[PDB]
Design a protein around this ligand. Structure first.
Ligand code: HEM
Length: 152
């Protein structure tokens, strides 16, 4: 279920994200690359990337757009980490385009893990980050299951 964060935890989440917030596109590019390199079955899910070598698409406009859009959603979630309706709406709106897509929970969680690993958080910041991400994927997975309206 969705579990609100305390004020101190909300601050911890902003602080944890601050390095990435200050280099959002560059971080996105590296993390998305590392995700597709470690879990290459996912590259085919992106029709604009399908059928080319990863190293051949990594430097392209389309690649960078996709990485950017993922990280902009997380950036807006962090922005709304103190506003549960706002946070839920950011996710609800991005969920629609994924509902029909054949993407496993495993694939989504593999991305979460690449992001976690890149951030190298201490356990206090990590605990707060994981409270936010647990909210993120509870809202997302409810929406993928056609129960998005509960957050409206
Ligand atoms: C859980 C973090 C994720 C976020 C925040 C996110 C966000 C977004 C956003 C903002 C878009 C653009 C609007 C649209 O959907 O067309 C997009 C599209 C898309 N996403 Fe995600 N996404 C996530 C995970 C994934 C994963 C793990 C996959 C595949 C393994 C995936 C596959 C897609 C596909 C295939 C599209 C359209 C691709 C194209 O332009 O070729 N998404 N996503």
């Amino acid at each position: 279920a969705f579990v609100g964060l305390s004020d101190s935890e909300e601050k911890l989440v902003r602080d944890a994200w601050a390095p990435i917030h200050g280099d959002l596109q560059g971080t996105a590019n590296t993390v998305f690359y590392n995700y597709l390199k470690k879990y290459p079955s996912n590259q085919d899910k992106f029709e604009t990337l399908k059928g080319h070598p990863l190293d051949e698409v990594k430097d392209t406009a389309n690649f960078k757009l996709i990485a950017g859009r993922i990280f902009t959603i997380f950036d807006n979630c962090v922005k709304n980490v103190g506003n549960d309706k706002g946070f839920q709406k950011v996710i609800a709106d991005m969920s629609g385009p994924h509902v029909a897509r054949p993407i496993t929970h495993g694939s989504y969680n593999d991305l979460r893990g690449v992001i976690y690993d890149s951030m190298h958080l201490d356990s206090t910041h990590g605990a707060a980050w994981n409270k936010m991400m647990d909210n993120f994927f509870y809202v997302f997975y409810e929406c993928l299951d056609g129960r998005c309206s509960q957050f409206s």
